[PDB]
């Protein structure tokens, strides 16, 4: 298994989704994973399924409970997809449309189409039934660095580029970007009970909250901050990863509740389990899955 | 046969990458030596302790392979230029990281794209690299021909995209481009990679790159059309554009992913070899103008003059025509005209002289002056083994010779690219004592012609010409004899200095001074100033290395007058330069000026670095 830990998401039965990449020597490729149980990963002896794929995993995430989008280093998008029995990870489509590699997926509220993002600068809408893209819009003038698809509205999301632009999508539009009111964006996040409301991070380690109309702030992280992930309360908790290796939780206000720096290296992504409510796992490209247990 | 490459950001294994690109008929491959998206950190603990290795062995490829096939990559995630400084500390030691390990690596080239107005800390950190030691790798600048702001979709509801030309504002690339390599100093090892996109931009903005340094033209995949049969082509402007690449014979990259699920190479090498070349390999290359008066030319100099039946037959006919006009028919076997040829090297025009005799139908007698003893040699086992007493070669210069009679007509070549800048002038002048009150000269006149041009290029070639034992800058205060390729004609050429023979003038002076404006239609900088001439053989028989009239002679090639510092020009403003023919009784030489838009220093004050020997 490779040891550039990418991705990290919890399914709704509890099995654990690993995205690893191999970021440096020979051959720089990629793999995915399945651990029913999240206490044996990054084991790979111990896993319930997992295939290699032919280049680097830059994004993934889950289509449902069988399903797995991938971004690669190659430019295309890939779906893969669980066998009946769910100990093979299989090719569902690999489709080259982007022209570098895609940095960023999301799934839109139906499961049945996606947005993707790429350093070609280009946003692009799939839909997965047919494998194919049906718009494709350039609406930055940069690398596309996180693109996320809003929680409820299968028609509305997020995007923000290395042009300093944030973007409201909303497809039903002629013009269907919208610029939205400092430092390089790279995560977002849609509010889980709002939804017109997001948060941001930025390449100096600020966390921003943000209202739909037309704002809250605070220095979390000493360097880029590479993911937000809210936790499923009621009133959700904010966990903030970043390039210095360290992970924070933040409540309603922005304001830190927990902090941690057991990973050696950057910390690539962070999942909340569906069983366990206050327990937020973490992996990062020391090779590391830390299990956190979040005080409530 | 095109030079072409393959850009790639994703590399499982260079081992069989390699092999791909090689087997669909790429000669090189551009990739990352490090992982794209493996960013490392070089500050802060404890990702900077990450262990190695920090990315592929070079022992994966032969020694051979670096050095011929590998085009290395900047990682996408440097940013020097970055707002916070943490990010340009760790983007500086990366940078150099990356540009180390290509040396290392022995790499022909490494590229660094410019896609932002300011990149003043990436320039500097690449001139610190340039001067750790004095390498032979290459740095080819990825710079858009549009900018991506500039060609994004417009579908911003809040921002909507420009309506009105902006005429500069649509050149902003160019000056990305020029304001790195000034911070850079002109480095002879920073070249352009112009990248094309789907919609060119207005020609204004594509000529802004003539004369300029384009090693690679990047071509995505994207921009490629579809026609029946379903293969990639290009629009016929896209095409224009490629033609325009093919004579600066720049190696075109493709990139992207293949969106017709080696095609788009096929279709370069079908653009190739669809196109219609003597002075093939002189391009843009400098040479000293020759001085046949001072200096003695070698046998193989006078042989490529006489590589060119058009421009004797062009004498011939000048000659046939004056005999016709002097010798009335009732005088055909009575009356012999007295023929000087002044300069006639190995006998071109000796020959020329006698055809055209035969072909008037009168008689002559000729003389063949030439001071070149060597010259002198062929004359004379020519006159022995073929003309006889009919010719009578003469060992002399011109000014000196005391001719036993008088001419009815002279014949001279003394004429340079820059027309008089052989000292053509001073010669006939001192050989008109010995020609007839109403002899003819052949040439009567000629004209020399300036141009005002712009080449990055030739810039700095010149800048290269520096030497021990000389004033560091007397390279740009002499003209080059080159065959002016890769620049930028910025006006219409206009006459200079004009001469005319017989000169019957009383006060015979051969100093000159004259003030040109060349009107300049658009944004440019100025790097020196193009010359050719034009004369006249007798009447409306001529010759010129004009572009506008050039003789269809593969002989003169254009001049070039340099200026130390560039010129910025504005379109619509006035280029005014003054140039100067300057003379001692010893030499001769020329002085010259720019006054507008901006004053340059005199070139060559007092012939301090350029003289003509008399
Ligand atoms: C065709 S290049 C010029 C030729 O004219 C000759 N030439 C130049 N100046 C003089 C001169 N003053 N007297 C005689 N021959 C000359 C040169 O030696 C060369 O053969
Ligand atoms: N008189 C100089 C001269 N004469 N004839 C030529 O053909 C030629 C070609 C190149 C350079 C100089 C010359
Ligand atoms: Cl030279
Ligand atoms: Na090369």
């Known amino acids: ?296 | 046969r095109v030079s072409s490459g393959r850009d790639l950001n994703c590399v499982p294994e260079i081992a069989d990458t390699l092999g791909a690109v090689a087997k669909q008929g790429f000669d090189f491959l551009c990739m990352p030596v490090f992982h794209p998206r493996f960013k490392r950190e070089f500050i802060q603990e404890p990702a900077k302790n990450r262990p190695g290795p920090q990315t592929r062995s070079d022992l994966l490829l032969s020694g051979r392979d670096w050095n011929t096939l590998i085009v290395g990559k900047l990682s996408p995630w440097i940013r020097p230029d970055s707002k916070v400084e943490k990010i340009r500390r760790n983007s500086e030691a990366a940078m150099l990281q990356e540009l180390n390990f290509g040396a290392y690596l022995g790499l022909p080239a490494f590229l660094l794209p410019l896609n932002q107005e300011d990149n003043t800390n990436l320039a500097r950190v690449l001139t610190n690299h340039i001067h750790t030691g004095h390498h032979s790798s290459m740095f080819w600048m990825r710079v858009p021909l549009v900018a991506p702001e500039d060609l994004r979709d417009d579908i911003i509801e809040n921002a909507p995209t420009t309506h009105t030309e902006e005429y500069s504002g649509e050149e902003k690339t160019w000056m990305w481009w020029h304001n790195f390599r000034t911070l850079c100093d002109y480095s002879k090892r920073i070249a352009v990679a112009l990248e094309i996109g789907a919609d060119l931009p207005s020609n204004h903005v594509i000529d802004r790159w003539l004369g300029e340094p384009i090693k690679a033209a990047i071509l995505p995949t994207s921009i490629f059309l579809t026609n029946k049969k379903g293969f990639p082509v290009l629009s016929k402007m896209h095409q224009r554009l490629i033609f325009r690449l093919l004579k600066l014979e720049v190696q075109f990259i493709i990139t992207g992913t293949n969106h017709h699920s080696c095609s788009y190479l096929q279709y370069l090498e079908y653009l190739s070899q669809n196109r219609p070349l003597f002075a093939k390999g002189y391009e843009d290359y400098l040479q000293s103008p020759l001085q046949p008066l001072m200096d003695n030319l070698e046998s193989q100099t006078y042989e490529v003059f006489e590589k060119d039946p058009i421009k004797y037959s062009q004498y011939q006919q000048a000659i046939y025509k004056c005999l016709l006009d002097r010798v009335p028919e009732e005088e055909k076997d009575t009356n012999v005209q007295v023929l000087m040829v002044l300069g006639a090297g190995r006998g071109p025009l000796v020959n020329a002289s006698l055809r055209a005799a035969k072909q008037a139908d009168r008689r002559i007698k000729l003389y063949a002056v030439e001071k070149n003893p060597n010259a002198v040699v062929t004359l004379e086992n020519w006159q022995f083994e073929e003309w006889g007493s009919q010719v009578t070669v003469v060992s002399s210069d011109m000014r000196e010779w005391v001719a036993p009679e008088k001419a009815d007509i002279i014949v001279s070549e003394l004429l340079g690219s820059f027309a008089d800048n052989e000292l053509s002038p001073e010669c006939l002048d001192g050989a008109q004592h010995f020609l007839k009150d109403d002899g003819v000269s052949i040439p009567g006149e000629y004209t020399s012609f300036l141009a005002p041009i712009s080449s990055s290029k030739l810039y700095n070639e010149v800048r290269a010409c520096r030497e021990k034992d000389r004033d560091p800058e007397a390279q740009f205060e002499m003209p080059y004899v080159v065959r002016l390729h890769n620049f930028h004609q910025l006006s219409a050429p206009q006459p200079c200095f004009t001469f005319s023979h017989p000169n019957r003038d009383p006060m015979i002076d051969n100093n000159r001074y004259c003030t040109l404006e060349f009107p300049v239609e658009v944004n440019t900088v100025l790097h020196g100033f193009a010359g050719y001439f034009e004369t006249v053989l007798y009447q409306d028989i001529t010759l010129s290395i004009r572009p506008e009239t050039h003789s269809p002679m593969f002989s003169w090639f254009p001049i070039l007058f340099p200026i130390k510092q560039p010129i910025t020009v504005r379109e619509g403003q006035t280029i005014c330069v003054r140039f100067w023919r300057c003379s001692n009784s010893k030499k001769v030489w020329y002085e010259w000026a720019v006054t507008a838009p901006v004053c340059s220093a005199i070139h060559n004050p007092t012939g301090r670095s350029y003289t003509i020997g008399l």
């Open chain 1, 1 to 296: 298994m490779e040891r550039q830990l990418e991705a990290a998401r919890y399914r709704s039965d509890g099995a654990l989704l690993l995205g690893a990449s191999s970021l440096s020597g020979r051959c720089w490729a990629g793999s995915l994973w399945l651990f029913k149980d999240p206490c044996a990963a990054p084991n790979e002896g111990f896993c319930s399924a997992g295939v290699q794929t032919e280049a680097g995993v830059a994004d993934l995430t889950w289509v449902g409970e069988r399903g797995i989008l991938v971004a690669s280093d190659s430019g295309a998008v890939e779906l893969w997809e669980l066998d009946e029995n769910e100990t093979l990870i299989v090719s569902k489509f690999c489709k080259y449309e982007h022209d570098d590699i895609v940095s960023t997926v999301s799934v839109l509220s139906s499961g049945t189409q996606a947005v993707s993002g790429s350093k070609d600068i280009c946003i692009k809408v799939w839909d997965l039934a047919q494998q194919v893209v049906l718009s494709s819009y350039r609406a930055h003038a940069a690398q596309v660095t996180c693109v996320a698809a809003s929680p409820h509205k299968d028609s509305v999301f997020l995007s923000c580029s290395e042009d300093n632009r944030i973007l409201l999508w909303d497809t039903r539009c002629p013009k269907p970007a919208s610029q939205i009111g400092g430092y390089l964006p790279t995560s977002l996040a849609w509010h889980p009970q709002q939804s017109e409301v997001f948060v941001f991070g930025d390449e100096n380690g600020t966390v921003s909250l943000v209202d739909t109309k037309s704002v809250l702030s605070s220095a979390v992280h000493s360097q880029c901050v590479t993911g937000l992930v809210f936790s499923p309360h009621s009133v959700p908790f904010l966990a903030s990863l970043s390039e210095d290796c360290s992970l924070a939780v933040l409540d309603s206000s922005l304001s830190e509740l927990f902090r941690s720096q057991a990973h050696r290296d950057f910390v690539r992504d962070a999942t909340w389990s569906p069983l366990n409510h206050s327990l937020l796992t973490t992996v990062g490209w020391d090779h590391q899955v830390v299990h956190h247990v979040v005080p409530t």
